[PDB]
């Protein structure tokens, strides 16, 4: 069962849950999963009503791990208020800069995700589930295909699963190079065989999604929590970390740290602890200048003591931690973020289409020292006006991080003007 080469990302856990097996950089097959008591959560779940599973997941306080932090139980509840059939979708598009947390679950412990999909699908009455995995994760694709077959053979998928009368097939779809296909409505368009064009929201997918039917989309990491919630009960799960923002969380840490990799930690951990306590501090013991929360936010070195939770003052997002140190040029970094959004706007909305493009094009002129005064003023204006009329979150945030760098590092931008 040869898979393509995957770099061996470092992984460390204080909780031994999501990374119990995936802290080891290899495929864990169904017998190893079973030996660790895997699929007993599923068996337990199938002896429960859908309603009660939803209730446990709700009471667990589990929130979306794909960026927005929406309460998962609540999302499920909304779906099942709507007539079937219903569809369950695992979002494995993971394409935001700095973010590599989902793939280690996929590639090392696929049965944890599969088990979560089956439980979740049962909870919402979906008999057809999808994994949409980005095209640039080919090994993940083949690993999941093989794992699904393993699960079929042990009777965890197919018709009348373990005599429950519950039927499920999981189909694995591949992306083909569009970051936007991680946006849940564009993902659905892509599953329907079309271009990845976000739909106006509302309706949310739980009302109208795949083929216009009630659809739950959840992130890989979110789904991976579900077996634990069933296995240990919601009370014990909520005892993990702080009571409000409970449960394990994966933190993909890259840039100027000694130990770049994925860290499974509770969400009371501070950003400072992530970098210095777990990730081994900075390369060359240099001062931290900024942390980029993927391509979403930019924190200064004055903001290191924030909790890695979903609170208003917390780090939020996906817990993606890109560390820049004192010699890293912030304008050069912002250019890379601008370039990302230029490459990934789908172009449906005009301010987004032209704004992402002009933001990158003008910022490159600024960086190279070729910007006119008008180019400077134009850059500022365009950065502030990507969002208007936008129908998805890309347009809403394409200027966000770059604005934060302008506000938090004025002196460094001034150097480029003067």
């Amino acid at each position: 069962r040869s898979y393509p080469a995957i770099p061996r990302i470092y992984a460390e856990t204080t909780l031994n849950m999501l990374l119990k097996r995936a802290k080891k950089p290899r495929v864990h097959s169904i017998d190893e999963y079973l030996k660790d008591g895997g699929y007993q959560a599923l068996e337990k779940a199938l002896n429960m009503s859908p309603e009660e599973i939803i209730d446990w997941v709700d009471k667990s306080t589990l929130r979306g791990r794909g960026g927005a932090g929406f309460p998962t139980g609540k999302k499920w509840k909304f779906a099942v208020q709507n007539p079937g059939p219903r569809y369950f979708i695992c979002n494995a598009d993971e394409s935001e800069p700095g973010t590599f947390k989902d793939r280690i679950i996929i590639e090392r412990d696929p049965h944890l995700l599969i088990e979560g999909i089956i439980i979740s699908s049962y909870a919402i009455g979906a008999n057809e589930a999808y994994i949409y995995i980005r095209g640039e994760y080919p090994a993940g694709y083949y690993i999941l295909r093989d794992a699904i077959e393993e699960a079929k053979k042990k009777g965890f998928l197919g018709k009348n699963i373990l005599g429950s009368g519950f039927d499920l097939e999981i189909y694995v779809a591949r992306g083909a190079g569009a970051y936007i296909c991680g946006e849940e409505t564009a993902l659905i368009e892509s599953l329907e065989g079309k271009r990845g064009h976000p739909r106006l929201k509302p309706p949310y997918p739980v009302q109208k999604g795949l083929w216009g039917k009630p659809t739950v989309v959840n992130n890989v990491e979110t789904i991976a929590n579900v077996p634990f919630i069933i296995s240990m009960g919601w009370e014990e799960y909520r005892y993990i970390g702080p009571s409000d923002y409970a449960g394990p969380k994966l933190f993909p840490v890259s840039g100027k740290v000694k130990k770049p990799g994925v860290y499974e930690l509770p969400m009371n951990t501070t950003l400072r602890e992530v970098i210095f306590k777990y990730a081994g501090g900075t390369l060359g013991n240099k001062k931290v200048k900024a942390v980029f929360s993927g391509a979403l936010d930019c924190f200064s070195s004055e903001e290191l003591d924030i909790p890695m939770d979903y609170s208003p003052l917390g780090f939020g997002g996906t817990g993606t931690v890109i560390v820049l140190t004192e010699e890293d040029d912030i304008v050069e970094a912002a250019l890379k973020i601008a370039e990302f959004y230029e490459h990934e706007t789908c172009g449906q909305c005009t301010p987004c289409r032209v704004g992402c493009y002009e933001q990158a094009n003008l910022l490159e002129k600024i960086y190279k020292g070729e910007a006119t005064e008008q180019d400077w003023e134009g850059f500022d204006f365009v950065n502030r006006n990507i969002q208007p009329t936008s129908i998805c979150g890309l347009g809403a945030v394409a200027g966000r991080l770059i604005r934060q760098t302008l506000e938090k590092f004025p002196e460094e931008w001034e150097k480029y003007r003067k």
Partner: protein, 156 residues
């Protein structure tokens, strides 16, 4: 009158049979075609449309939309080099320089023998291992030119 070789047509049909509706298989089909030919032949789209029961322009629009597909350059091995923030900070330019030293090409270029094409790509989701590159489906951290040369020599 372009036709798929039988062995390829079988795999395409298999993707089309995989999902509940045929048209869901479009991206898997296009990956298969690109894997087989080393690019997307413009002639391939018409019979693919037929097999998916879709209009041709639908298929063309999809090929145009998704960045992984290439209708212009045939290449046996695609070297996808990440050019996003983390890889840039950690040494994309070192990797590109090394690639130029060994293969004599820059991003966007194919070697004369049509063996290697360097494709600049967005974040590959392996940022801890920056700077990252792929060779077709295989993915690696770039360590040095000596290391890279050895890796590339595995692709004949």
């Amino acid at each position: 009158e372009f036709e798929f070789p039988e062995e390829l047509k079988t795999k395409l049909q298999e993707h089309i049979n995989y999902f509940p509706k045929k048209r869901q298989a479009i991206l898997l089909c296009l990956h298969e075609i690109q894997n087989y030919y080393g690019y997307i032949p413009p002639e391939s789209l018409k019979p693919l449309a037929d097999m998916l029961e879709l209009p041709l322009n639908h298929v063309e629009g999809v090929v145009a939309f998704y960045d992984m597909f290439d209708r212009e350059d045939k290449a046996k091995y695609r070297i996808r080099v990440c050019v996003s923030i983390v890889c840039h900070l950690m040494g994309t330019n070192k990797l590109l320089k090394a690639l130029e030293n060994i293969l004599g090409i820059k991003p966007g270029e194919v070697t004369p023998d049509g063996k290697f094409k360097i494709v600049p790509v967005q974040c590959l989701g392996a940022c801890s291992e920056a700077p990252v590159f792929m060779v077709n489906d295989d993915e690696y951290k770039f360590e040095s030119e000596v290391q890279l040369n050895e890796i590339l020599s595995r692709y004949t």
